[PDB]
Design a protein around this ligand. Structure first.
Ligand SMILES: NC(=O)c1ccc[n+]([C@@H]2O[C@H](COP(=O)([O-])OP(=O)(O)OC[C@H]3O[C@@H](n4cnc5c(N)ncnc54)[C@H](O)[C@@H]3O)[C@@H](O)[C@H]2O)c1
Ligand SMILES: NC(=O)c1ccc[n+]([C@@H]2O[C@H](COP(=O)([O-])OP(=O)(O)OC[C@H]3O[C@@H](n4cnc5c(N)ncnc54)[C@H](O)[C@@H]3O)[C@@H](O)[C@H]2O)c1
Ligand SMILES: [Zn+2]
Ligand SMILES: [Zn+2]
Ligand SMILES: [Zn+2]
Ligand SMILES: [Zn+2]
Lengths: 374, 374
């Protein structure tokens, strides 16, 4: 069978910036020492993938993007002890080597072996596993889920429940976990608290789920797209405001609504301006603000430090602060137990081939999550 | 007696910015309802006061500054219940109305009654007590301790032990408590951590006393004035670095020293650039950076949101997050029990009249805390 030999398959290769993904045949080389080749079953369309198209998130092109997914191990490389063939797995865009200061810390999850801070677009050995039209194709976040077949490092994959609905749990590989964790793990939303979530897409709604799970009495969803309101309220938002419906600045509106600032604000969009607004909207003397949205490349935000001096707490986080490899298998199990629901995020289920349509659905604000089935 | 009548005494009136504190005769009106008039025994020269002069910290002028102090209750107004004449008290530049949102909050301390964010430079009733040259002089943070007698609203004053050495505990009015709290309360330094303190002044040194008290195994002090090193080490610094001695930006040097970044970083200077540096020096995935230094009025800082997205926590606080009226008496009580040393911050003792010279020392870097006696 396929094990031990280069696997030709279709993948969504991104050649240039701001250009459509090109579904072509790529050569997926076999897994080397401590690498895992996974047959993709379902990949979700996260806004971060679109960020690479726009240039918001700089990474080496050409590249096979995608990181939010779930699949089954085709074959494992030499030295792989954590997964075996036929294992349902979820590629972790944030690895967990377990050997670094961050992995040994009880609170940090951002493993230094991450290829996010300073993208290279390779495996941990610095090489590529994809070849297309001769040219070597770079990897995205050590995952590259936009391919019928992919190869990841052992530290960037987790074995999940064998009876898991991959088409649904793939969201745990990013969107859900991120939002959920940003709520209960990073910010640690309290019982009776008031939260303001900026951005109501896959991650935003997931923050609402986390706020509600934590017992937030009042949850305010903030989106310039009213079509996102209906769902936000469905997942926990107690109300929704549209910045472009008023004349005065939103923080004024939010300040007045919350009566002096919210307990928790979440920036789940990825804009420097809304990041400052989220900070401002949390109570000056004890408010917590968490930045979930990935900011535009090389761009700095200008803010007044007095926002902090007064007593505010500003935070940010990758994968909801969840230690990916230890958490993902645990999050899937909890989904199996039905502690949380991924269905509200799934709005469009298309074939891998329609990847570009799904992206257009995202871009038009018509979709939350588009699940590409392989 | 003077109880019930205007008291003519001397005060340090700052008529214009960047001008000397004119020691002249001002009239102090008797305390109105729920107000308290205190006889100043000793007041500490805090950099925040110098800020008022230089214009860094804005408040209505002409003003009688001063906020770090201790004195005795001369008389109380109608309805005052918390203090009685003859009581040794410390003015709280940060009020504790015990009614507002932040006061009712379990961990908030920047009471809304404060006069820091929106400086009115008056009492709670919007009126002043000071008269000089016939001109009504402003109050500073509702304390105005640069006068032999000042009128503070009841919520901005706390009764400390009758056996408290006022000339030493006046440091608990701000300096010490700020830094100590910033470390032990706001940041919550863990046992065995590596702390990096920016600025080795009275406040900075107190932050060191906090990390040291918290169990911080390492404490790197940062200052462009090498002379401040000896005392830092004396109070807790494991080492101290003069940024000017390096060809590469200090944050890098700090990251290198701590093997990836510090656990807790502190900014006790008040510069925008140093704030960004302190944040960047703490470990990107679990670093906590606490800003204490007051920034130049209306000035914004440009920072990279990725510093936060990775996992850093950035926060600030006024008075070390301590609920003034609550903590203050206890902090004095701890000093009574020899729980922390105040002496190390006291380098010069000068009579109130030699006020300018005290500011000279500060500005020349020849001092930490110059205690003014009356
Ligand atoms: N740090 C992490 O671990 C992590 C994980 C997942 C996603 N993200 C990031 O979070 C952000 C959102 O992800 P998503 O999949 O939910 O995206 P999305 O496109 O589904 O949602 C973004 C939402 O914010 C709204 N919005 C845009 N501008 C707005 C504005 N000016 N005011 C108010 N609302 C506005 C949009 O209408 C949209 O609903 C992205 O930047 C993504 O890259 C980060
Ligand atoms: N947040 C609060 O409630 C609060 C309370 C007290 C003081 N403060 C503020 O904290 C700051 C410091 O207070 P302080 O009382 O310790 O004063 P200070 O002047 O004695 O301390 C400042 C120290 O930092 C050093 N320094 C200056 N520039 C530096 C630089 N570029 N790099 C490194 N070191 C540098 C100075 O040499 C000095 O030793 C002030 O801005 C003050 O207003 C805030
Ligand atoms: Zn690691
Ligand atoms: Zn994502
Ligand atoms: Zn209050
Ligand atoms: Zn002070």
């Amino acid at each position: 069978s396929t094990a031990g030999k280069v696997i030709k398959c279709k993948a969504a290769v991104l050649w240039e910036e701001k250009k459509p993904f090109s579904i072509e045949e790529v050569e997926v080389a076999p897994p080397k020492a401590h690498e895992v080749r996974i047959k993709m079953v379902a990949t979700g369309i996260c806004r971060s993938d679109d960020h690479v198209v726009s240039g918001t998130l700089v990474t080496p092109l050409p590249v096979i993007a995608g990181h939010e997914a779930a699949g089954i191990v085709e074959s494992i490389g030499e030295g792989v002890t954590t997964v075996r063939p036929g294992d349902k797995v979820i590629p972790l865009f944030t690895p967990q080597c377990g050997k670094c200061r961050v992995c040994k810390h009880p609170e940090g999850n951002f493993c230094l072996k991450n290829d996010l801070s300073m993208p290279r677009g390779t495996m941990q050995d610095g090489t590529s596993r994809f070849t297309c039209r001769g040219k070597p194709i770079h990897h995205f976040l050590g995952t590259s889920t936009f391919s019928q077949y992919t190869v990841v490092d052992e530290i960037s994959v987790a074995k999940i429940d064998a009876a898991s609905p991959l088409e649904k749990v793939c969201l745990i590989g990013c969107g859900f976990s991120t939002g959920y964790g940003s709520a209960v793990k990073v910010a640690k939303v309290t019982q009776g608290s008031t939260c303001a979530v900026f951005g109501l897409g896959g991650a935003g709604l997931s923050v609402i789920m986390g706020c509600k799970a934590a017992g937030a009495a009042r949850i305010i969803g903030v989106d310039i797209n009213k079509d996102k309101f209906a769902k936000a309220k469905e997942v926990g938002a107690t109300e929704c405001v549209n910045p472009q419906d008023y004349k005065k600045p939103i923080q004024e509106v939010l300040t007045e609504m919350s009566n002096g600032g919210v307990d928790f604000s979440f920036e789940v969009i990825g804009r420097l301006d809304t990041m400052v607004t989220a900070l401002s909207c949390c109570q000056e003397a004890y408010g917590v603000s968490v930045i979930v949205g990935v900011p535009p490349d090389s761009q700095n935000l200008s803010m007044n430090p007095m926002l902090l001096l007064s007593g505010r707490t500003w935070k940010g986080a990758i994968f909801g602060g969840f230690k990916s490899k230890d958490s993902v298998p645990k999050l899937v199990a909890d989904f199996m137990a039905k502690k949380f629901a991924l269905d509200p995020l799934i709005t469009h289920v298309l074939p891998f081939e329609k990847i570009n349509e799904g992206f257009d659905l995202l871009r038009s604000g018509e979709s939350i999550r588009t699940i590409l089935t392989f």
